[PDB]
Design a protein around this ligand. Sequence first.
Ligand SMILES: C[S@@+](CC[C@H](N)C(=O)[O-])C[C@H]1O[C@@H](n2cnc3c(N)ncnc32)[C@H](O)[C@@H]1O
Ligand SMILES: C[S@@+](CC[C@H](N)C(=O)[O-])C[C@H]1O[C@@H](n2cnc3c(N)ncnc32)[C@H](O)[C@@H]1O
Lengths: 240, 238
Amino acid sequence: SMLWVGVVSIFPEMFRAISDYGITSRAVKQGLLTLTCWNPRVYTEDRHQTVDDRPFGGGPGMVMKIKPLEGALADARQAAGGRKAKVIYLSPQGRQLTQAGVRELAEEEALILIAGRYEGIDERFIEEHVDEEWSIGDYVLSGGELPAMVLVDAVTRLLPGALDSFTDGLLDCPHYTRPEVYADKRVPEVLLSGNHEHIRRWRLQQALGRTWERRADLLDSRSLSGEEQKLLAEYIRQRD
Amino acid sequence: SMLWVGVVSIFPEMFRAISDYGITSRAVKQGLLTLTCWNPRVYTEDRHQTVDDRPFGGGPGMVMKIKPLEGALADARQAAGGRKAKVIYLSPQGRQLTQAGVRELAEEEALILIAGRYEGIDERFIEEHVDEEWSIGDYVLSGGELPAMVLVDAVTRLLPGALFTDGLLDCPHYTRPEVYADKRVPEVLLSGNHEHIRRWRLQQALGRTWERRADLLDSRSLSGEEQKLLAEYIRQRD
Ligand SMILES: C[S@@+](CC[C@H](N)C(=O)[O-])C[C@H]1O[C@@H](n2cnc3c(N)ncnc32)[C@H](O)[C@@H]1O
Ligand SMILES: C[S@@+](CC[C@H](N)C(=O)[O-])C[C@H]1O[C@@H](n2cnc3c(N)ncnc32)[C@H](O)[C@@H]1O
C-alpha cells in the first residue's frame, strides 16, 4: 500500500513476470506494492477501432492513437485516488534511469507507466499528459513493457521491509561462497582469515579497482578520498 | 535456428513475457529464434532445492552456489550442440548495453545467458565459465531475468524477417485524427512531399537530440545538411 503502480499497456497479462515472481510478488503479498494494469483497447470509441493507425507523413510501421491511451490514463488516475501520481512514459528519448533516479521514484506515492508499442505513441498525448519521460538505456526495444517492469523491480527493492552497486557510486566487489576451493581457485584468504577492517579495506579496494578497470567514467564524477586514492594506486600496481 | 538462446535462471516462468509476446514470440513461431530455459533448482542435491549459500567474509545476503549453476550451464552447452555459444552473465558490473553492443550480439549464432539472483554469483564461476558480462544500465535489479529479456528483445529486432541506427533520438510521431482537442498534426506531414517530410523529420531528430542528449551529437559526424537543419531548429525557437 505504500506504493501504488498503474501500467498502461496493450499486454497487461505480460506483467505476471513481476506480479507472480520475485521481490515485486513478495511486496504485493506484504501490501508494500499495489500493481494494476489498463489495456488501451478497452478504451477505444467503439470496439471496432484498434489502438494503432497509419503514421502521418508515411514511413514503415503504425502509431498508437491518442484517445485509447487518454481513456486508459483517465481511468488509472481515478483508481489512484488521493495520491500524487507521476505519469511516466517509458521511451529511448527519455531521461536515463540510474540508481539516483530509482531512489527519487521510490519517494512517489503513485506512478502511472505508459508502455508503448508499435513505432511509438502520438506526440500530442505526450505533450498533454506525460509528466516525465524515462529510458532504461541506449538501445531499442520492441515495446515499453520490459522497461516498465525494470523500473518497478528497481524501485520495489528500495521499499522498506522489501529486502551494493551505485549506492556509493562504485561497482561492487567480487562475491564468494562455499567451498573454500573450486576448479583450483581458492577464496581470497582475507575473506577466510580476516578481521572486519581487513575485509572492509579489501572490499573497498576491489570495488575501486573494478570501477577503474571497467567504468572509469564513474570515477571522473566521484571524489576519491585519501584512503581510496591509496587503495586504488595499490590495486593498479598489484593487478597482475 | 537463426539464433539459439539458452537461459540459466531459477524463474524460467518469467520468460513467458518473451516466449508469448511480441517479435520474440513471433521469431520463435517463425523458427528464427530458439528459446530454452535451464533451472539450477533442478541441478540440486537436497529436498528443498537449495540454490543459495552464505557469503565468505560476512555481510548480509546470500550468493548463488556454484554446483547448481555449473550443472544448468553444462546442460545448456550440450543443448547448444555444435553452435559457437557466447556465455553472458547479466550484472551491473558488466559492459553497458547500447545499440552498437546489440548489433555485435546479433552476429552470434548462440547465446547462453546467466541470470543471477541474491547478492550475485561466485567470482570463480565467472572467471572460469563466463565469456562476457553485460549490464542493461546503471541501476540495481533483484535478478537477471528482466535484463536477459531486454537483451533478447533488442537482438531479436535485428534478426532478418523479425520486424540508435542514425545515432540520433527519433522524430515525434503523429496519427489520425488530423486535429485532436485544439492540437493539430504539423502540416508538413499532412502534405505529400516526401523530401519535405524527410527534411522536417531529420531536423526534429537533430533538434530533440541537441536538447536532450547532446552527448550523442558530440560523438556524431554531422553532414552539411544536418548542420543546417539543426542551426535552423535552434534559431527558430523561443
Ligand atoms: C519500436 S519502439 C521505439 C521507437 C522509437 N525510438 C520512437 O519511439 O520514436 C516502441 C516502444 O518501445 C519502448 N522502448 C523502446 N526502447 C526503450 C528503452 N530503451 N527504454 C524505455 N522504453 C523503450 C517505448 O515505450 C516505445 O513506445
Ligand atoms: C541484487 S542483484 C546483485 C547486485 C550486486 N551488487 C552484485 O554484486 O552484482 C541480483 C542480480 O540482478 C542482475 N542485475 C541487477 N542489475 C542488473 C543490471 N543493471 N544489468 C544487468 N543485470 C542486472 C544480476 O544477474 C545480479 O546478479
